[PDB]
Design a protein around this ligand. Structure first.
Ligand SMILES: *[C@@H]1O[C@H](CO)[C@@H](O[C@@H]2O[C@H](CO)[C@@H](O[C@@H]3O[C@H](CO[C@H]4O[C@H](CO[C@H]5O[C@H](CO)[C@@H](O)[C@H](O)[C@@H]5O[C@H]5O[C@H](CO)[C@@H](O)[C@H](O)[C@@H]5O)[C@@H](O)[C@H](O[C@H]5O[C@H](CO)[C@@H](O)[C@H](O)[C@@H]5O)[C@@H]4O)[C@@H](O)[C@H](O[C@H]4O[C@H](CO)[C@@H](O)[C@H](O)[C@@H]4O[C@H]4O[C@H](CO)[C@@H](O)[C@H](O)[C@@H]4O[C@H]4O[C@H](CO)[C@@H](O)[C@H](O)[C@@H]4O)[C@@H]3O)[C@H](O)[C@H]2NC(C)=O)[C@H](O)[C@H]1NC(C)=O
Ligand SMILES: *[C@@H]1O[C@H](CO)[C@@H](O[C@@H]2O[C@H](CO)[C@@H](O[C@@H]3O[C@H](CO[C@H]4O[C@H](CO)[C@@H](O)[C@H](O[C@H]5O[C@H](CO)[C@@H](O)[C@H](O)[C@@H]5O)[C@@H]4O)[C@@H](O)[C@H](O[C@H]4O[C@H](CO)[C@@H](O)[C@H](O)[C@@H]4O[C@H]4O[C@H](CO)[C@@H](O)[C@H](O)[C@@H]4O[C@H]4O[C@H](CO)[C@@H](O)[C@H](O)[C@@H]4O)[C@@H]3O)[C@H](O)[C@H]2NC(C)=O)[C@H](O)[C@H]1NC(C)=O
Ligand SMILES: *[C@@H]1O[C@H](CO)[C@@H](O[C@@H]2O[C@H](CO)[C@@H](O[C@@H]3O[C@H](CO)[C@@H](O)[C@H](O[C@H]4O[C@H](CO)[C@@H](O)[C@H](O)[C@@H]4O[C@H]4O[C@H](CO)[C@@H](O)[C@H](O)[C@@H]4O[C@H]4O[C@H](CO)[C@@H](O)[C@H](O)[C@@H]4O)[C@@H]3O)[C@H](O)[C@H]2NC(C)=O)[C@H](O)[C@H]1NC(C)=O
Ligand SMILES: OC[C@H]1O[C@@H](O[C@@H]2[C@H](O)[C@@H](O)[C@H](O[C@H]3[C@H](O)[C@@H](O)[C@@H](O)O[C@@H]3CO)O[C@@H]2CO)[C@H](O)[C@@H](O)[C@H]1O
Ligand SMILES: *[C@@H]1O[C@H](CO)[C@@H](O)[C@H](O)[C@H]1NC(C)=O
Ligand SMILES: *[C@@H]1O[C@H](CO)[C@@H](O)[C@H](O)[C@H]1NC(C)=O
Ligand SMILES: *[C@@H]1O[C@H](CO)[C@@H](O)[C@H](O)[C@H]1NC(C)=O
Ligand SMILES: *[C@@H]1O[C@H](CO)[C@@H](O)[C@H](O)[C@H]1NC(C)=O
Ligand SMILES: *[C@@H]1O[C@H](CO)[C@@H](O)[C@H](O)[C@H]1NC(C)=O
Ligand SMILES: *[C@@H]1O[C@H](CO)[C@@H](O)[C@H](O)[C@H]1NC(C)=O
Length: 968
């Protein structure tokens, strides 16, 4: 419509007039705020065979103060976009304004709790509130569209606009049309795509006002039961997605904008390791090939890399880690087998244009395979090839199943295997068998083994096939030439030549075989060996791979290596590879250009040999250096009391008064004389402190109080210095009604009730009209028994300044309301020389909150990517306590001893300074009259990786500076 660079038809997108299958991964820049590591992820995604990344922008992080848009430094989208371009990865931009995303407010800033109108509706107050954010974020996106030479090809307005309640005329076409117009008015001309939470047809082309350009929906078919990772429940495998697609949006390519790539894990859950097991390689091969059986043309995996909910950006139900059990782990490693398996499918899609021009049929339990225990879904082409997706009919089956195929080809129907034996499907696996597969003019009549990749080089053609262990396979090629085995044993390889073809049968082996048929070389691999192959694009003009255009795909090389191959480029007589290694690694290059004489790996000339088939070989030795990490318990820990409020000398006269007679919160009307909702006073994040002043009569007995912080929150209450008690918290409770006995009080004396409340984050707003994001935080109800409720005059604080937030570098969410946070002591070089010496391992002897500070040095070597972890012990059932850890001012750990499950906290290079000084600030809150302490506190690492990554620059780490506006 509005530009010629990205168009579509009923089958696929076109980019500059060429069909492409968009295979994408979800990656959120605000969860990895280090620009060099963003590039690392993009390159790891490109190495899967993927061509796109989908991202959210978090409004809450970039407009913490209403009217002040700030997407600078660590929140700057421009280096993220340049890193996508450099990696050769297109982008799907999803700026919301509502994003959900397991984030605080679902993206909405806390100040939306004061908006007089329904969130995500036509109400003018809501739409006005979004205008400054969208005109800024969409203008930045506009500048980096493909129409302006950037990477961004598609735009998503809103997020899962799918269910309404409570008087909203859902779906509101005026609402969606306004949201789409905002983006258009900011210069966005690329196609708009939506993400219906289920396949319900909302906003599809043809629905009139508020229709998007391309209809997308989401799917998490296997669910989120991470505690039972081997259980695949009955009927969870979708079978009707093409049927629903033809009914709801037949004119647009079939698109799943969020397909399950992992799972969330709540406070108290089984842990993200368990989620990786549920959504593992078996899940991918069965569920993702099933999506291929519907001829999906835009597929985005949520998440490909999850990262971290640092600095309180997460929603209340989640904890610090957002690992998500995804293909790329929270610590950026690609060890999980699901990565290597996904790489096989991504590379298959990258070289198979006939996939998008075929004609999909219904699944069948007969006609293609000779057992009803198997299901085959055909994608049939006239001359462009056909595809046959095979799985067990009972998709959860772990049975080993023998079968024969009867397939249609351009040379007629064929019963496979022709030369004898049977095919095998071992349990939770699925195959894409191919017929009339075009390898640059050479016709593969059929292959039962799956295609990984193929290329045409100057000196011939190469095709790479694989199968699982124990399987027999067969292929046929249209040709007059015979077959010869050119590498590996001739055993288990049977052949037959006809007048117009050669048939070849083979058993899968751990040892590679290479056969040759005319100018085609065919590598015959087992799955586990195929995991070690890579297909980098080969740059001749520079060093960057470029986007996956048909030309740059065709000129790729095949590299057998280990952990990672990032790039390849040719320059003069040098073949340059960039790669990473986690072990001593044999490197083989196939398709070396004729002009190349020398092999360089990561800048360094590397000796190579050339075997009889023209394959260059080399070795990269892995010899890890001594990684020396300091013992955190032995540091020079300085302590300060971070709850001075409970001492009688404390003067709170500069605190904001909690004296508002009316709330601006439309969701929940006041049940106290004044509002004690934190967001009414601009406080949306971290720990909240309330102080209630009263004069005693002498007859007081009890104080009852309803506190609300969200799932797994806690609160503690003191009367002057006297500890009344705590709600220690449960995932099940987002609020709690406590009743405390007071000590005997003195007539006419003044007292202060101090209340500490853990704000776990603001709720999401999934159902339009329910306004759940407005769920307040703080005190809902109180009663000083026998006294009118107006007896207590309340003051409060959250982060210092509230919406006039102090740390513009680290963003509006990072810090909360504790004394030591308000003073800025969590930053590098706090004024701690004369503070008491005490360690968090010594801890507290009564209920309270202590603040601990120490520095340490790292001297880790260059050229090594070393994932570092911060560990808090939990070997025995603990007393109830809560811990935050700030690393160079960035909150990178939130720990609740009694709820869990996280004890291991990754912290990226860039936040940590690998050749320099680092600062740890630790708050320790004992919700127990006997106090508490850490069992252990350790810094650890996992496998160092010899890496091609450039220098990781430290992010801005503003040091401590005295604050004018503090209560002091
Ligand atoms: C450097 O980077 C590298 C990446 O570039 C990285 O390599 C990767 O490492 C990861 C692990 O970190 C690998 O992923 C695991 O792979 C395991 C091995 O299975 C795979 O490989 C075999 C063939 O290879 C083997 O055999 C040779 C010897 O012949 C050895 O050289 C190999 O080391 C390997 O041997 C191991 O496994 C044997 C048993 O299989 C053992 O006898 C032996 O002692 C070794 O432990 C294939 O046959 C496998 O295919 C079969 O199984 C898969 C998966 O189940 C099926 O899908 C397939 O159809 C075949 O049947 C397979 O490819 C896996 O065992 C391991 O599996 C599990 O963990 C994941 C979670 O991570 C789960 O999804 C999965 O369900 C499995 O869960 C079990 O294990 C975990 C504990 O780890 C439990 O939580 C869970 O409860 C469950 O345990 C229970 O069930 C099991 C039943 O059999 C059994 O363990 C117990 O009975 C138990 O009760 C996982 O997938 C990855 O493949 C590597 N990738 C590459 C490219 O190499 C390397 O680590 C990095 N290095 C460093 C130093 O950092
Ligand atoms: C790629 O990225 C991944 C994400 O970043 C990353 O995975 C994370 O890795 C860290 C570090 O390894 C994990 O933290 C550790 O978890 C250990 C417990 O989990 C284990 O328990 C089960 C074993 O049956 C399994 O569930 C689990 O395996 C599963 O998960 C694997 C992924 O990790 C997966 O591959 C498997 O297939 C499977 O699904 C796993 O085995 C935990 O033990 C460990 O804590 C110890 O180590 C810390 C660091 O040194 C110490 O500070 C800490 O105190 C613990 O050490 C002490 O306790 C141990 C108890 O046995 C002893 O072994 C130690 O020697 C030590 O002993 C002292 O203390 C004892 C009391 O505790 C006492 O008894 C002793 O006398 C002594 O005083 C740590 O928490 C994290 O969970 C992973 N995160 C996720 C999301 O998976 C992965 O590693 C990356 N890979 C690479 C190569 O980079
Ligand atoms: C340090 O080590 C200590 C000692 O081991 C660790 O302490 C243990 O920590 C466990 C995790 O917090 C804790 O188990 C939990 O205990 C409560 C008991 O009431 C229970 O609610 C928990 O189970 C639910 O919640 C978790 C998530 O927090 C879910 O993963 C789980 O499936 C359960 O979910 C159900 O309840 C939720 C409400 O909270 C619902 O949202 C959810 O949908 C689901 O609801 C269905 O089932 C309910 C009935 O079960 C029903 O009411 C509802 O209608 C639905 O049908 C979990 O068992 C241990 O008790 C605790 N042990 C000790 C000795 O203290 C500590 O965590 C470790 N610390 C660290 C840092 O790792
Ligand atoms: O990363 C998590 C992922 O969750 C996805 O939603 C999940 C299911 O797809 C969705 O059908 C289900 O819908 C729930 C809703 O989440 C709850 O608010 C509940 O009260 O009402 C609905 C019941 O049908 O929610 C699942 C998550 O638990 C999101 O679509 C996706 O964007 C992610 O957030
Ligand atoms: C193929 O599509 C539908 C799936 O809804 C199936 O029920 C039917 O047998 C086939 N369609 C027709 C028109 O026969
Ligand atoms: C096979 O691919 C070549 C490009 O290498 C193309 O010109 C030819 O038309 C293709 N043939 C078919 C039948 O798709
Ligand atoms: C093809 O190769 C086979 C097995 O190596 C051989 O026996 C046969 O004679 C060859 N075909 C022709 C036509 O020569
Ligand atoms: C309680 O604290 C206040 C000031 O915070 C102080 O003035 C008052 O005297 C204290 N009450 C008692 C009984 O000591
Ligand atoms: C919102 O203000 C409108 C007037 O603009 C008024 O009708 C309504 O009572 C107000 N409600 C709340 C909860 O603020
Ligand atoms: C606390 O009491 C209030 C007011 O009666 C009630 O509505 C709320 O549900 C209670 N909270 C819990 C967690 O039961």
């Amino acid at each position: 419509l509005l530009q010629k660079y990205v168009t579509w038809d009923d089958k696929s997108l076109f980019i500059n007039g060429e069909r492409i299958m968009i295979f994408s991964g979800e990656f959120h820049p605000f969860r990895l705020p280090v620009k060099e590591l963003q590039l690392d992820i993009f390159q790891k995604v490109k190495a899967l065979g993927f061509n796109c990344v989908s991202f959210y922008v978090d409004w809450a992080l970039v407009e913490g103060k209403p009217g002040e848009y700030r997407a600078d430094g660590i929140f700057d989208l421009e280096p993220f976009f340049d890193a996508a371009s450099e990696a050769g990865i297109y982008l799907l931009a999803r700026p919301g304004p509502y994003i959900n995303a397991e984030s605080s407010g679902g993206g909405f800033p806390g100040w939306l709790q004061r908006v007089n109108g329904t969130l995500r509706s036509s109400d003018k107050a809501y739409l006005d509130a979004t205008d400054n954010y969208v005109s800024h974020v969409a203008a930045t996106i506009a500048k980096y569209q493909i129409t302006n030479g950037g990477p961004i090809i598609l735009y998503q307005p809103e997020n899962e606009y799918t269910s309404g309640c409570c008087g909203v005329e859902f779906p509101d076409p005026v609402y969606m049309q306004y949201v789409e117009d905002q983006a258009r008015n900011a210069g966005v001309v690329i196609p708009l795509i939506n993400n219906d939470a289920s396949a319900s047809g909302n906003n599809a082309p043809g629905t009139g006002k508020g229709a998007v350009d391309i209809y997308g929906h989401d799917s998490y078919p296997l669910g989120f039961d991470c505690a039972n990772p081997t259980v695949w429940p009955s009927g969870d495998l979708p079978t009707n997605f093409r049927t629903l697609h033809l009914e709801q949006s037949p004119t647009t390519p079939y698109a799943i904008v969020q397909f399950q790539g992992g799972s969330y894990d709540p406070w108290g859950g089984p842990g993200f390791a368990a989620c990786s097991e549920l959504l593992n390689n078996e899940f991918e091969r069965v569920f993702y090939k099933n999506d291929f059986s519907f001829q999906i043309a835009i597929m985005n995996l949520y998440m490909i890399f999850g990262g971290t909910n640092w600095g309180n950006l997460g929603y209340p139900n989640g904890y610090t880690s957002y690992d998500y059990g995804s293909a790329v782990t929270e610590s950026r490693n690609i060890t999980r087998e699901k990565y290597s398996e996904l790489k096989l499918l991504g590379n298959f899609a990258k070289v198979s244009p006939g996939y998008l021009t075929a004609s999909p049929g219904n699944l069948t339990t007969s006609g293609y395979a000779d057992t009803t225990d198997l299901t085959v879904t055909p994608l049939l082409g006239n001359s462009t090839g056909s595809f046959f997706v095979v799985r067990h009919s009972d998709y959860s089956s772990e049975e080993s199943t023998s079968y024969k195929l009867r397939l249609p080809t351009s040379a007629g129907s064929v019963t496979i295997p022709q030369l004898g034996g049977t095919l095998t499907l071992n349990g939770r696996d699925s195959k894409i068998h191919v017929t009339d597969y075009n390898v640059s003019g050479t016709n593969i009549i059929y292959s039962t083994a799956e295609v990984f990749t193929w290329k045409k080089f100057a000196d011939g053609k190469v095709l790479v096939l694989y199968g699982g262990a124990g399987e027999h396979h067969e292929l046929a090629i249209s040709t007059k030439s015979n077959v010869t085995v050119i590498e590996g044993s001739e055993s288990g390889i049977s052949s037959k030549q006809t007048s117009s073809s050669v048939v070849v049968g083979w058993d899968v082996s751990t040892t590679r075989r290479i056969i040759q048929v005319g100018d085609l070389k065919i590598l015959l691999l087992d799955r586990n060996s195929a995991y070690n192959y890579w297909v980098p694009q080969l740059a001749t003009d520079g060093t960057s791979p470029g986007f996956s255009t048909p030309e740059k795909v065709a000129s790729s090389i095949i590299v057998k290596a280990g952990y990672l191959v990032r790039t390849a480029y040719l320059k003069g007589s040098g073949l340059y590879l960039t790669a990473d290694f986690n072990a001593t690694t044999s490197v083989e290059v196939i398709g070396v250009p004729s002009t190349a004489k020398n092999l360089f790996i990561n800048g360094d000339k590397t000796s190579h040999t050339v075997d009889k088939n023209g394959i260059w070989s080399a070795t990269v030795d892995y010899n890890a250096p001594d990684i020396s990490l300091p013992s955190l318990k032995d540091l020079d820990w300085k302590y300060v009391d971070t709850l001075p409020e409970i001492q009688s000398s404390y003067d709170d006269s500069l605190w904001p008064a909690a004296d508002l007679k009316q709330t601006k919160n439309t969701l929940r009307s006041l049940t106290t004389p004044t509002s004690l909702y934190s967001s009414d006073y601009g406080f949306h994040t971290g720990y909240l402190l309330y102080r209630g002043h009263f004069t005693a009569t002498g007859n007081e007995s009890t104080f009852a109080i309803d506190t609300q912080g969200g799932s797994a929150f806690g609160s503690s209450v003191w009367l002057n210095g006297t500890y009344l008690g705590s709600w220690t918290g449960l995932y099940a409770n987002s609020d709690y009604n406590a009743t405390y006995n007071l000590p005997q009080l003195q007539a006419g004396k003044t007292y202060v009730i101090t209340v500490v409340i853990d704000n776990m984050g603001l709720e999401e707003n999934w159902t339009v009209g329910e306004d759940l994001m407005k769920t307040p935080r703080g005190i809902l109800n109180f009663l000083l028994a026998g006294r009118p409720s107006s007896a207590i005059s309340w003051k409060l604080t959250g982060n210092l300044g509230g919406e006039d937030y102090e740390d513009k570098v680290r963003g509006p969410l990072n810090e909360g309301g504790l004394y030591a946070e308000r003073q800025g002591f969590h930053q590098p070089e706090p004024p701690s020389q004369n503070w008491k010496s005490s360690s968090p391992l010594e801890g507290l002897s009564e209920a309270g909150i202590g603040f601990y500070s120490a520095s340490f040095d790292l001297d880790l070597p260059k050229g090594w990517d070393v994932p570092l972890f911060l560990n808090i012990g939990n070997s025995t059932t603990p007393s109830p306590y809560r811990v935050q850890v700030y690393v160079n001012g960035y909150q990178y750990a939130k720990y609740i001893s009694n709820i869990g499950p996280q004890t291991s906290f990754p912290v990226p290079e860039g936040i940590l300074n690998y050749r320099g000084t680092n600062w740890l600030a630790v708050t320790l809150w004992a919700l127990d009259s006997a106090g508490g302490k850490l069992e252990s506190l350790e810094l650890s690492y996992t496998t160092p990786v010899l890496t091609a990554l450039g220098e990781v620059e430290s992010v801005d780490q503003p040091k401590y500076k005295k604050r004018k506006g503090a209560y002091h």
